[PDB]
Amino acid sequence: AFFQQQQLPAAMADTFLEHLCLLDIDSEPVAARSTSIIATIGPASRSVERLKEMIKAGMNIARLNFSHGSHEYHAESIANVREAVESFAGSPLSYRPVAIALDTKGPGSGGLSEQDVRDLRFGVEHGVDIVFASFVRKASDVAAVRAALGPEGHGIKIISKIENHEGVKRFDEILEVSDGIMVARGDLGIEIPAEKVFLAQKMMIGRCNLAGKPVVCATQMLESMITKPRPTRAETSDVANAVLDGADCIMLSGETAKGNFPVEAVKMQHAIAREAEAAVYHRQLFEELRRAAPLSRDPTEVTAIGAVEAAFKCCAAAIIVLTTTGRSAQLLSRYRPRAAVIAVTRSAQAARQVHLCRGVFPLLYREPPEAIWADDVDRRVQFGIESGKLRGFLRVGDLVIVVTGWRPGSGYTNIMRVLSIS
Amino acid sequence: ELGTAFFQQQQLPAAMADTFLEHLCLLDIDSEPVAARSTSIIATIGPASRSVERLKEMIKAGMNIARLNFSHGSHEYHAESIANVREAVESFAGSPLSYRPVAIALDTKGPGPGLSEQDVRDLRFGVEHGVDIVFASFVRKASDVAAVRAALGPEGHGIKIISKIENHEGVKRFDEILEVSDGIMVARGDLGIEIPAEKVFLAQKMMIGRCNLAGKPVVCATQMLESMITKPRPTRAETSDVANAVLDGADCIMLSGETAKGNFPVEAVKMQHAIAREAEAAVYHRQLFEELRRAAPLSRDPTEVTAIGAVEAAFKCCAAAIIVLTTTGRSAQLLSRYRPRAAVIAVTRSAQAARQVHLCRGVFPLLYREPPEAIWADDVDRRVQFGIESGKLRGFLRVGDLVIVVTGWRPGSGYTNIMRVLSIS
Amino acid sequence: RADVAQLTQELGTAFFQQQQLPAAMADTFLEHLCLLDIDSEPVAARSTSIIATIGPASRSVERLKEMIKAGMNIARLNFSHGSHEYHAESIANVREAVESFAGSPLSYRPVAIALDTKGPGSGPGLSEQDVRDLRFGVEHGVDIVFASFVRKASDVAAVRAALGPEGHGIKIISKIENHEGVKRFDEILEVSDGIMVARGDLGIEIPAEKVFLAQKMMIGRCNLAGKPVVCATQMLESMITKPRPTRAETSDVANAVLDGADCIMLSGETAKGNFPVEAVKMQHAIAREAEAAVYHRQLFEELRRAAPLSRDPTEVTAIGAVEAAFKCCAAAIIVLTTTGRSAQLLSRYRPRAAVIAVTRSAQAARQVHLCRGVFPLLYREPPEAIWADDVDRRVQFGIESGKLRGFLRVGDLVIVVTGWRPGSGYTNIMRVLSIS
Amino acid sequence: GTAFFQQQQLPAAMADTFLEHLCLLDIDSEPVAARSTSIIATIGPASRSVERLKEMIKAGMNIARLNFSHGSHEYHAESIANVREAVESFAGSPLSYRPVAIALDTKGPGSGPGLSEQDVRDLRFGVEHGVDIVFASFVRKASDVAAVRAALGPEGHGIKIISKIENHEGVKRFDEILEVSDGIMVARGDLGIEIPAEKVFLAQKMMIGRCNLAGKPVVCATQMLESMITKPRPTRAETSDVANAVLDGADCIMLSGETAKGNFPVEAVKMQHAIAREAEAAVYHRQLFEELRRAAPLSRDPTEVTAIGAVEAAFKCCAAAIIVLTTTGRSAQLLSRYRPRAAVIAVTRSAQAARQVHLCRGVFPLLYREPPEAIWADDVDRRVQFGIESGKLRGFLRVGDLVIVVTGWRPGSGYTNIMRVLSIS
Ligand SMILES: O=S(=O)(NCc1ccc(Cc2ccc(O)c(O)c2)cc1)c1cc(O)c(O)cc1-c1ccc(O)c(O)c1
Ligand SMILES: O=S(=O)(NCc1ccc(Cc2ccc(O)c(O)c2)cc1)c1cc(O)c(O)cc1-c1ccc(O)c(O)c1
Ligand SMILES: O=P(O)(O)OC[C@H]1O[C@](O)(COP(=O)(O)O)[C@@H](O)[C@@H]1O
Ligand SMILES: O=P(O)(O)OC[C@H]1O[C@](O)(COP(=O)(O)O)[C@@H](O)[C@@H]1O
Ligand SMILES: O=P(O)(O)OC[C@H]1O[C@](O)(COP(=O)(O)O)[C@@H](O)[C@@H]1O
Ligand SMILES: O=P(O)(O)OC[C@H]1O[C@](O)(COP(=O)(O)O)[C@@H](O)[C@@H]1O
Ligand SMILES: O=C([O-])C(=O)[O-]
Ligand SMILES: O=C([O-])C(=O)[O-]
Ligand SMILES: O=C([O-])C(=O)[O-]
Ligand SMILES: O=C([O-])C(=O)[O-]
Ligand SMILES: [K+]
Ligand SMILES: [K+]
Ligand SMILES: [K+]
Ligand SMILES: [K+]
Ligand SMILES: [Mg+2]
Ligand SMILES: [Mg+2]
Ligand SMILES: [Mg+2]
Ligand SMILES: [Mg+2]
C-alpha cells in the first residue's frame, strides 16, 4: 500500500517518459503540501474571522500590496493577520507561523521612488518579514531597497520582482544580490510578448533552483475564481505546472484580495500543489541538483547533501533540522528531498521567513530552556518529533534524519544522525 | 558554414544542454523561433466562425482542423458549416504559397450504456459528407470504439477515430481504448467534473505520454484560452496552459467556445499559433529522442526502421526538412512519433490523407495532383522535387540546405524502406 | 566548470590536475578515458590490498619486514604444500616481522594471515586433510580461510563446521575454480564472507578465453553485494624469473583494480620467485595508478541506484558519509568499528577518501584489509570512565595518526562516523570536521 | 526466438547500468557474430613459409606486419611475395576470398631528430612493392608524419600512415599527431621503457578513447600473448590483456614474437581470434552508442549523415549486417566509428581498399572482380547481391535476416547518400 500511494510507481521509473505513463489519478498524495501559498490581503480577506479560515485553508504568507491603500489601512491588515495567527498559539505542537510580505508600488516613470522609501520605512517599523520589490531592473535597484530598509531592517528578505525585458536580461546580477525572485507575470506579460512569458518563468525558476534561492510564481493563476466558485482547466494546469517547474511559492492576488471565493482559491492551490509535488520526478531531479551543486568546504552545505542522500536511502519521513536564521533548512530544501524538512527554531521571524523555501515546515520552539546545551538540543529534536507525530508527518517505526551543530549560534551545522521513531 | 546567428535562434543553446535543469536555465526570450509551427490547431465552428469570410481569416491565422460539435445544431446547419469550410479552403487553390488542406472533424453528442441513436445517425451523416475524423464522446471501454467503428458503415473505414477520455472509467481503461483507437482527446471539460479538478493535469500528462509512446495522435482540449471568449488578450494561466500542453507532447491543441461563440475567434487562433511556435523550439529534443528510442520496442517493419534512421540523420545535419512520400499518411506518422526538429513534408496524392496527417505533430501535407509518369522512378523523383520546390516557395528550404528523403522500393502503400540525404540545388 | 570553480580557487589548479581528477569529473565514460593523463600523479594511499604467498623466497623475518614495508597486507599460507610444522614457523616469522613495528602505535601496520586449503581433490566435499588443516588454522589464530574448489553452499557450511565454535570470527573467502562454482555463484556468495577468482584452475576447467567474463561478473556481483573479492594467479607471472613484468601483466593488474577487486594476489611470484619484494612493489605502484583512474562519477551513481533501499542505520549513515566526502573532496572518513562492519559498509560505496578504521580488535584490524580503502588503526588505550570521552579520544587518535601518516593536513575536511551507544551495530552518526 | 536473446551476451546488453551489465555476463552465452577486431601478425622465420601463411590466413590473420628493424630489402621482398602467394591461393573462390593487408613497420629515427636515411630508403621500397600501410616508429610530433608522407612520394598517396606512439613526447603531442595521421599504434614495448611501466595502461586507454572519438583506427601492440612464443597456452594475464584491449576499443590487436619467431604462430592467431570474439559480445553497446553519437560533431557531409542513420536503423531491427559499397574504404570507416553490432560488409573493386579496411573494427572486406555492367544501377545491384551471397556462405547472413544497404547516387568516391532496409531472400 505504501508503494502505491504518492505516485511512487511513477517515482521508480527509469525514464521521464515512463514516469509520465505511470502517473495515476487513484494514487493519493500522503506528504504534507510543500509549496507555500501567498495570499494578497484586501477587502475580501481582511477580517480576523476570514483570515482564520484562510490560515486553516493553507495560507503561509500574507501579501500587502502597497500600490493601493494608506499606511493606516495596511497597519490594520497587519494587526488582523497577527490576531488571526495568534488565535491558534494555544497549541504549540500545531501552531502555524504566517509571514507578512510588503509588495512595493514601484518606481513608476522614475530607481527607488520617494513613496517606496516611506513604505519600506513603514515595513521596518511594523516588523514585516519580506519585501517583494517591484520592477527590479538591475543589482543597484536591490542595493537601494536594502539601504532604505536601514540598520533595523537587516533581517528582512528581499524578493526581487522581474517584470520587464531588462530584469530578465540582467537576471543573473539581480539574483546574486537578492534573497529570491518573483516571476511577476502581470507586468511581464505586457512588457514582453505574452507568448514568451512561459520561457522567462521556466528559465528563472531553473536558475533559482540551481542557486538554491526561493522563487515565487505569481499572477492570474486562478483568475476566474474572482467571480466563479471553480477554476478553469487552464488555471488548474497553470498551478500544477508552476509546482512541477520548481516554484518554491505560488501566489493569489485578486483571487483573495477582492474576489468572492478567497478561501476556496487558497483550498484549490493547496489541493493542486499536493498532487503536483507527488508527481515530481525525484529520480532525475535529485541527480541533476546533486551534479549541478558545486563542490563545497562549508560544513552546513556538506552536511545538507549527506542528510538528503541518507533520507532518500531509507525513505525517511522527515529531516529534522535545528536552525537560528533558517539557513540550514534552506540548504536541505535546495536538494528537493521527498522527506519533509521540519525546521525547529526559536526565532519567530526565521519561522515565518522559511515559508519561502519549498518543503520547510517551521516549528516555533517555546518550551523552557535546558541548563545543559546538549540536553537543550535533544529537547528541540524531541519537540520536532512530537509535533511531527501530532501533525501526521511521523509515526512510530519511521526513520528520520536529524541535522544539528557542534556549538551554539548560527553557522556551525555539521552533524547528521539516523533516528528510529519511538 | 551556418554561422553563430543560426545557433542562437530557435532555443538551440538550450537544445544542446547536457541536463534538463541546464536546458531550462538556457531558455531565452530573445531566441526567436524559425521553424514552421508543428502542433495543429483545431477550431470549433459556430455562429462566430461560420461565414466564408471569417473562415478565410481563420485559415490564414493557422486553423488546420475544423471541429463540428454535434451536441448542438441540426444536420442542415452542420452541412452548411462543412460547405463554408470547403469554400474558404478552395479559395486559396490559385496560390501554392497559401493553399492548405483543412481536415473536418465530427465531435459526437455522446451516450445510455453505449452508442446512442443520435450518434448512429450523426456518424452516418459524417460518412455521407466525407468527414476526415470523428472525436467520439465519452469513450469508456474498447467496445465503445468498436461500436463507433461499426457505425462508420461500409464507406467510412478510412475515417480516423479519436477517442475522447472524459471520465474515471475512460482513464482507468485507457490502454484498451488506445489499442483500438487512432488517437485520443483529453476532454478536460467533462473530465474536470467527473474526477477532482486538481487531478486533471495527471490524467493529461499520463495520456499524452502514453500516446507519444504508442506513436498515436493526442489532442489537448477545453478552456485553453477561455477568457478570450470576451477579452482580446488571454490570462497568464492560459498562455502557460497552451505552452505546457505542447511541451507535454500534444500533437494538437483545441479551441471550443473561443472560436465557436466568442468575440475574438481569429485572435484566439493567432494566440495558439504564437505560443505553439515558441513552445516547440523549447522542447528538450536531446532527452526526448533518447527516451523515445529506448522505450520504443525493436522492430522488423522497414517503415519503422527507416523512420528512426531518417530522424537520426536529420538531427545529425540540422536538416531543414524530411520529405516523405505517403499514400495513407503512415510513413509520415512514423517519422512524427520520433519528434524530429526538422519539418516532415508529406507528399501525397490522397486528399484525405493530406487532411488527416494534420493530427500528427510536425507533418506538413502537400497534395500532389500531376498525372502519373509511365516510369515509376520518374514519378517518385517528380514528387521529391515537388516537395523541394514547395519547401523553397514556403521558406522551409534554400539552395545549399540538406534534406532527408524517405521513399519505398516499389509502388503502393506499405513498402517504405529508403532514406536518402540530398543537397538542395 | 561552475560545479568546481570555487573549490578550484580555494584548493588550487594543481590539486585538480593530480590523481586523475580531470578524468574523474568527466561527463561521459568516453571523455573520462580521453582525459586519463600519464602526468597526473596519484596522491592517495594505496587502497587495494596485496596478498603475498609465503614460501622459501619470503619466509625469513628480515625478508618479511621488507615485504611489509613494500606493501604486503595479507600473508597467504598455501596448505597444498608443506607440513603443519613448516606453516607454524611461517606464521611465527610473519608475527615477529609485524610486531617489530609495534613500538609506534600511530604508525603500526596490521598484517592478516590467510590459510589456503588443499581442496577436495577427487572427492565430493570436505577432505580429511582439510579438516585437520582447518583445525590447525583455528589453533594458530588465522584471520581468513581461502577455501579451495567451492562448488555449492554446502561446501562453505562444511568449512564453517570444521572451524568449530572457536573459529566463528574467521572470514571464509570461497575460491571459484570451476564451471559449477560459477553457475552456483549466487548461493555461494550468500553464505560466504567473500570470493576469490582463482584463475589458475578456472582457466583449465573452463575455456581460457572465457575467464575474463567470469572474473568481471564475479567482481561486479561482489561489488553489488558489498562483499570482498580477490583477483588471483599469474598477475605478474614472468616476475618469478625476471625483474620486470610484461606489458600484459601490468595491464592485468591495472584492469583487476579497475574491474573492482578489493584485493590482488601474488603466488609463485612471492613464494618461490627471485624478486618477491619487487613483485609486491610493482603491484603497489600499479594499484595506486589504477585507483586514481576509477570513474567514480558513474561508479557511485550505479552503486547508489543498484543498492536496495535500507532501514539499517549503519547502511544509511555510510551512504550519507560517502556522499559528504565527495562533496568536499574529504581527505579521509574516520570510522569507529568493533567488528569492521561499519568500515565495510563505507568501502562498498567506493569513496575516493581513505577509510581510517579505529578499532580495539586486533583481529578486525587484520581482517578489514579484505575491504578496499580501509586503513586499520589498532587502538590500545584502556577505556575512559565516560563513554562519550572514550569515543572522542578514539576520533582524535584517528586524526593524529592521519596527520602523522600524511593522510590529513591542517585545513582538510574529514568525515567522522560513530554510533549512539557502545557495542557493535549502532553506527548512526556522520560529522563534518575541519582539521586544525 | 528466446534462443537468439540468450546468445552473444544479449541479457547483459539489455542492462540499465554498467554494473548490472557486468553482473549479467554469462560464460555459457556463446558468441554468434563474426570476430570484428583485426589481427596483425608479424612475419618472420616462424611464419614465412607459403604453407604456414595459408594456415595463418585460415586462423584469422588480417594484416601481415614486416618489421624493417630486422632483415634486408631482399628478405622483405620475399616475405611480401610469400604472403601474396598464400593470399592468392584462395582467389579461385571469390565468395570466400580473404584480403590480407601488408604493413611496413619502420626501423625509426634512432638517435636522430627526425626521418632517418634508412627510413627514406625503406619507405621508397614500400611504395615500389605496393605496401598498404606504414607503421611509423617513434612519432613524436606532426612534422614526423609529414616527413613520412613526403618520403612516400606522389605514388604512395594512398598508403595509410599509422603513427606509433612510443615515448613521453608522442603521448604529450598526441592530438597534433592524430590530426595528421590515418591512425595510431600504442607501441607498448618502447612505451613501457620510455615512461614508468605502471602508467602504460593510462596511455593505452587514453589513446584508444581519443581514436574512437576521432573515428580513426587504433592498434594495441606488444607482449599480448608473450608466453606463447614458447608455450602452447597463454597466461591468465595475457588472455585478460587481449580481452581488455578489445573492451577498451582497439580496432586491431597485434602479435610480434608470437608469430615472427615463436613455436605457436598459428595457435597465437587462433587465441587472439577466440578472445576477441568473446570480448566483442561483452561490449556494453547501450552506453557506447549513446556516447559516440553525443560526442560526434554535427555534420553536413552526406556520407557521415547516412552512416549514423544506417547504424541507428541496424540497431532498431537487430540487422545481421550493413552492406556498403566503397571505393576508398571511407564509407565503411564512417559506419565502423559508430561501433554497430551488425557486421559491416564492405564490397569494393579496389584491392588496396579491401586490404586497408581491416584497420577499422567490424569491417569485412569483399573484393569484387567482375567488370562493370553497362547500366550503373545493375552494377550496384550485382555488387550488393555479391555481398549477400558471400555473407550467406560465410555464416554472416541467413534467409529472413534484415540487412541495411548503404550506396551512393553516382559512380566514384565521395557520393554515399542512401540507406535501404532489405529482407534476405
Ligand atoms: O526531455 S524532456 O523535456 N524533460 C525530461 C525531464 C523532466 C523532468 C525532470 C526532473 C527535473 C530535473 C531538473 C529540473 O530543474 C526540473 O525542474 C525537473 C527531468 C527530465 C521530456 C522527455 C520526454 O521523454 C517526454 O515524454 C516529455 C518531456 C517533458 C515534457 C514536458 C515537460 O514540462 C517536461 O518537464 C518534460
Ligand atoms: O564507471 S565505470 O567505469 N563504467 C564505464 C562504462 C560505461 C559505459 C560503457 C560502454 C562504453 C564502452 C567504451 C567506451 O569508450 C564508452 O564510451 C562506453 C562501458 C563502461 C564502472 C562502473 C561500475 O558501476 C562498475 O561496477 C565498474 C566500472 C568499470 C570498471 C572497469 C572497467 O574497465 C570499466 O569499463 C568500467
Ligand atoms: O541554520 P543556522 O542559522 O546556521 O543555525 C544552525 C545552528 O543551530 C544549532 O543547531 C543550535 O544552536 P542554538 O543552540 O544557538 O539554537 C547550532 O549548533 C547550529 O550552528
Ligand atoms: O505511408 P504509406 O501509405 O505506406 O506509403 C508509402 C509508399 O509511398 C511510396 O514511397 C511511393 O508509392 P506510390 O508511387 O505508389 O505513391 C512507396 O514506395 C511506399 O510504400
Ligand atoms: O562496525 P561495528 O562493528 O558495528 O562497530 C560500530 C560501533 O562502534 C562504536 O562507534 C563505538 O563502540 P564501542 O565503544 O563499544 O567500541 C559504536 O557506537 C558502534 O555501534
Ligand atoms: O566510400 P567511398 O570511397 O566514398 O565510395 C563510395 C562510392 O561507392 C558507390 O556506392 C559506387 O561507386 P562505383 O560504382 O564507382 O563503385 C558510389 O555511389 C559512392 O560514392
Ligand atoms: O506586480 C505583479 O505582481 C505583476 O505584475 O504580476
Ligand atoms: O467534450 C469536450 O470537449 C470536453 O468535455 O472537454
Ligand atoms: O588455486 C588457485 O589459487 C588458482 O587455481 O588460481
Ligand atoms: O615498436 C613496437 O612495436 C613496440 O615498442 O612495442
Ligand atoms: K505592488
Ligand atoms: K460534442
Ligand atoms: K591451495
Ligand atoms: K620496427
Ligand atoms: Mg507588477
Ligand atoms: Mg465533453
Ligand atoms: Mg586452484
Ligand atoms: Mg618500438
Short mmCIF file of N, CA and C in Angstrom, two decimals, chain B residues 61-135:
data_model
loop_
_atom_site.label_atom_id
_atom_site.label_comp_id
_atom_site.label_asym_id
_atom_site.label_seq_id
_atom_site.Cartn_x
_atom_site.Cartn_y
_atom_site.Cartn_z
N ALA B 61 -4.88 32.59 -40.12
CA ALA B 61 -4.37 32.66 -38.77
C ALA B 61 -3.72 31.33 -38.30
N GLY B 62 -4.06 30.21 -38.93
CA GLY B 62 -3.46 28.93 -38.58
C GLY B 62 -4.36 27.73 -38.32
N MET B 63 -5.69 27.86 -38.49
CA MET B 63 -6.59 26.73 -38.27
C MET B 63 -6.27 25.57 -39.24
N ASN B 64 -6.06 24.35 -38.70
CA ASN B 64 -5.74 23.17 -39.53
C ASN B 64 -6.87 22.16 -39.59
N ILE B 65 -7.69 22.12 -38.52
CA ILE B 65 -8.80 21.18 -38.38
C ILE B 65 -10.03 21.94 -37.90
N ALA B 66 -11.16 21.75 -38.60
CA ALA B 66 -12.42 22.39 -38.22
C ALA B 66 -13.26 21.37 -37.48
N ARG B 67 -13.65 21.69 -36.24
CA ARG B 67 -14.45 20.79 -35.42
C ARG B 67 -15.93 21.17 -35.47
N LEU B 68 -16.78 20.18 -35.78
CA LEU B 68 -18.22 20.38 -35.79
C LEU B 68 -18.76 19.71 -34.56
N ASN B 69 -19.31 20.48 -33.62
CA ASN B 69 -19.84 19.91 -32.38
C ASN B 69 -21.28 19.49 -32.57
N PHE B 70 -21.51 18.18 -32.71
CA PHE B 70 -22.86 17.66 -32.92
C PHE B 70 -23.73 17.64 -31.64
N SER B 71 -23.23 18.19 -30.52
CA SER B 71 -24.05 18.36 -29.32
C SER B 71 -25.10 19.48 -29.56
N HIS B 72 -24.86 20.38 -30.53
CA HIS B 72 -25.75 21.49 -30.87
C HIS B 72 -25.91 21.57 -32.40
N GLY B 73 -27.04 22.06 -32.87
CA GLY B 73 -27.27 22.25 -34.29
C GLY B 73 -27.80 21.05 -35.03
N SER B 74 -28.55 21.30 -36.09
CA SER B 74 -29.13 20.24 -36.92
C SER B 74 -28.13 19.74 -37.97
N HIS B 75 -28.49 18.67 -38.71
CA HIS B 75 -27.67 18.16 -39.80
C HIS B 75 -27.55 19.23 -40.89
N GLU B 76 -28.64 19.98 -41.16
CA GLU B 76 -28.66 21.04 -42.17
C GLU B 76 -27.66 22.15 -41.80
N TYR B 77 -27.62 22.52 -40.52
CA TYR B 77 -26.71 23.54 -40.01
C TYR B 77 -25.25 23.10 -40.21
N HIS B 78 -24.92 21.85 -39.82
CA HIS B 78 -23.57 21.33 -39.96
C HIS B 78 -23.16 21.13 -41.42
N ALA B 79 -24.10 20.74 -42.30
CA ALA B 79 -23.78 20.60 -43.73
C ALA B 79 -23.39 21.96 -44.32
N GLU B 80 -24.05 23.04 -43.88
CA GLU B 80 -23.71 24.37 -44.34
C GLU B 80 -22.34 24.80 -43.81
N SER B 81 -22.01 24.45 -42.56
CA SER B 81 -20.70 24.73 -41.98
C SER B 81 -19.59 24.04 -42.79
N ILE B 82 -19.80 22.76 -43.17
CA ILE B 82 -18.86 21.98 -43.98
C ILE B 82 -18.67 22.62 -45.34
N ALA B 83 -19.78 23.03 -45.99
CA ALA B 83 -19.72 23.68 -47.30
C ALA B 83 -18.92 24.99 -47.21
N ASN B 84 -19.14 25.77 -46.15
CA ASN B 84 -18.43 27.04 -45.95
C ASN B 84 -16.95 26.83 -45.71
N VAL B 85 -16.57 25.78 -44.94
CA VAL B 85 -15.16 25.46 -44.71
C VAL B 85 -14.50 25.09 -46.04
N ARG B 86 -15.14 24.19 -46.81
CA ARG B 86 -14.60 23.78 -48.10
C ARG B 86 -14.48 24.95 -49.10
N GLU B 87 -15.46 25.88 -49.09
CA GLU B 87 -15.40 27.06 -49.96
C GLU B 87 -14.23 27.97 -49.55
N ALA B 88 -14.05 28.20 -48.24
CA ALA B 88 -12.94 29.02 -47.76
C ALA B 88 -11.59 28.37 -48.09
N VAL B 89 -11.46 27.05 -47.92
CA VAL B 89 -10.21 26.33 -48.23
C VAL B 89 -9.88 26.41 -49.72
N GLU B 90 -10.88 26.15 -50.58
CA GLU B 90 -10.66 26.18 -52.03
C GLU B 90 -10.44 27.58 -52.60
N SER B 91 -10.75 28.64 -51.84
CA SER B 91 -10.49 30.00 -52.31
C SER B 91 -8.98 30.30 -52.45
N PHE B 92 -8.11 29.48 -51.84
CA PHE B 92 -6.66 29.63 -51.90
C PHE B 92 -6.00 28.67 -52.91
N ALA B 93 -6.78 27.92 -53.71
CA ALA B 93 -6.21 26.98 -54.67
C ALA B 93 -5.35 27.64 -55.77
N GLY B 94 -5.57 28.92 -56.03
CA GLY B 94 -4.82 29.63 -57.06
C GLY B 94 -3.39 30.01 -56.70
N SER B 95 -3.04 29.90 -55.40
CA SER B 95 -1.70 30.25 -54.93
C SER B 95 -1.03 29.12 -54.13
N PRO B 96 0.03 28.50 -54.70
CA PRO B 96 0.73 27.42 -53.98
C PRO B 96 1.32 27.82 -52.62
N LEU B 97 1.64 29.11 -52.45
CA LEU B 97 2.19 29.65 -51.21
C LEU B 97 1.15 29.66 -50.07
N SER B 98 -0.13 29.87 -50.41
CA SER B 98 -1.19 29.95 -49.40
C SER B 98 -2.14 28.74 -49.31
N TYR B 99 -2.22 27.88 -50.34
CA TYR B 99 -3.13 26.74 -50.28
C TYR B 99 -2.76 25.76 -49.16
N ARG B 100 -3.74 25.39 -48.32
CA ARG B 100 -3.50 24.44 -47.24
C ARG B 100 -4.73 23.56 -47.03
N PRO B 101 -4.55 22.23 -46.98
CA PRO B 101 -5.69 21.37 -46.65
C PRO B 101 -6.17 21.64 -45.23
N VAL B 102 -7.46 21.46 -44.99
CA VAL B 102 -8.06 21.65 -43.67
C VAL B 102 -8.93 20.42 -43.40
N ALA B 103 -8.66 19.68 -42.32
CA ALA B 103 -9.44 18.49 -42.00
C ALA B 103 -10.79 18.87 -41.38
N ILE B 104 -11.79 18.01 -41.55
CA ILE B 104 -13.10 18.23 -40.94
C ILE B 104 -13.35 17.12 -39.94
N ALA B 105 -13.56 17.50 -38.68
CA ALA B 105 -13.76 16.54 -37.62
C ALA B 105 -15.19 16.64 -37.05
N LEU B 106 -15.83 15.50 -36.84
CA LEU B 106 -17.18 15.46 -36.29
C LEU B 106 -17.08 15.04 -34.84
N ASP B 107 -17.51 15.89 -33.91
CA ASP B 107 -17.48 15.59 -32.48
C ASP B 107 -18.89 15.15 -32.06
N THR B 108 -19.03 13.89 -31.63
CA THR B 108 -20.35 13.35 -31.31
C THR B 108 -20.98 13.89 -30.01
N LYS B 109 -22.32 13.84 -29.96
CA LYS B 109 -23.08 14.26 -28.79
C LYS B 109 -22.76 13.36 -27.60
N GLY B 110 -22.66 12.06 -27.84
CA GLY B 110 -22.31 11.11 -26.78
C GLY B 110 -23.44 10.21 -26.36
N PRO B 111 -23.15 9.29 -25.43
CA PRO B 111 -24.16 8.32 -24.99
C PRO B 111 -25.23 8.90 -24.06
N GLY B 112 -27.23 6.68 -21.45
CA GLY B 112 -27.22 5.34 -22.03
C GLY B 112 -25.92 4.59 -21.81
N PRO B 113 -25.97 3.26 -22.02
CA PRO B 113 -24.77 2.43 -21.79
C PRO B 113 -23.72 2.43 -22.89
N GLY B 114 -24.14 2.68 -24.13
CA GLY B 114 -23.24 2.67 -25.28
C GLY B 114 -23.67 3.62 -26.37
N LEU B 115 -23.45 3.24 -27.65
CA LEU B 115 -23.76 4.11 -28.79
C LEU B 115 -25.25 4.53 -28.89
N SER B 116 -25.51 5.83 -28.79
CA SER B 116 -26.87 6.36 -28.86
C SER B 116 -27.41 6.38 -30.29
N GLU B 117 -28.75 6.48 -30.45
CA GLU B 117 -29.41 6.54 -31.75
C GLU B 117 -28.97 7.78 -32.51
N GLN B 118 -28.87 8.91 -31.80
CA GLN B 118 -28.47 10.15 -32.45
C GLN B 118 -27.03 10.04 -32.95
N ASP B 119 -26.13 9.41 -32.18
CA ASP B 119 -24.75 9.21 -32.63
C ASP B 119 -24.68 8.33 -33.87
N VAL B 120 -25.52 7.27 -33.98
CA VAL B 120 -25.53 6.43 -35.19
C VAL B 120 -25.90 7.28 -36.41
N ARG B 121 -26.92 8.15 -36.26
CA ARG B 121 -27.35 9.00 -37.36
C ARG B 121 -26.31 10.07 -37.70
N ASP B 122 -25.66 10.65 -36.69
CA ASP B 122 -24.65 11.68 -36.90
C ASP B 122 -23.38 11.09 -37.54
N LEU B 123 -23.00 9.86 -37.16
CA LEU B 123 -21.85 9.18 -37.76
C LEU B 123 -22.15 8.86 -39.23
N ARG B 124 -23.40 8.48 -39.55
CA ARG B 124 -23.82 8.23 -40.93
C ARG B 124 -23.75 9.54 -41.74
N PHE B 125 -24.15 10.66 -41.13
CA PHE B 125 -24.06 11.97 -41.77
C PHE B 125 -22.57 12.29 -42.09
N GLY B 126 -21.68 11.99 -41.14
CA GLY B 126 -20.24 12.19 -41.34
C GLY B 126 -19.69 11.43 -42.53
N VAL B 127 -20.07 10.16 -42.67
CA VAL B 127 -19.65 9.33 -43.79
C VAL B 127 -20.17 9.91 -45.11
N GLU B 128 -21.46 10.28 -45.14
CA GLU B 128 -22.07 10.83 -46.34
C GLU B 128 -21.48 12.17 -46.75
N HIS B 129 -21.01 12.96 -45.78
CA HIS B 129 -20.41 14.25 -46.08
C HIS B 129 -18.87 14.22 -46.19
N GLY B 130 -18.27 13.03 -46.12
CA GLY B 130 -16.83 12.85 -46.27
C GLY B 130 -15.95 13.46 -45.20
N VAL B 131 -16.38 13.41 -43.91
CA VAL B 131 -15.56 13.93 -42.82
C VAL B 131 -14.29 13.08 -42.68
N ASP B 132 -13.23 13.69 -42.16
CA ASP B 132 -11.94 13.02 -42.03
C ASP B 132 -11.74 12.32 -40.70
N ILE B 133 -12.30 12.89 -39.64
CA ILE B 133 -12.06 12.45 -38.27
C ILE B 133 -13.34 12.45 -37.46
N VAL B 134 -13.43 11.56 -36.48
CA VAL B 134 -14.53 11.55 -35.53
C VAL B 134 -13.90 11.72 -34.16
N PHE B 135 -14.38 12.69 -33.37
CA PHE B 135 -13.97 12.84 -31.98
C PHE B 135 -15.14 12.16 -31.23
#
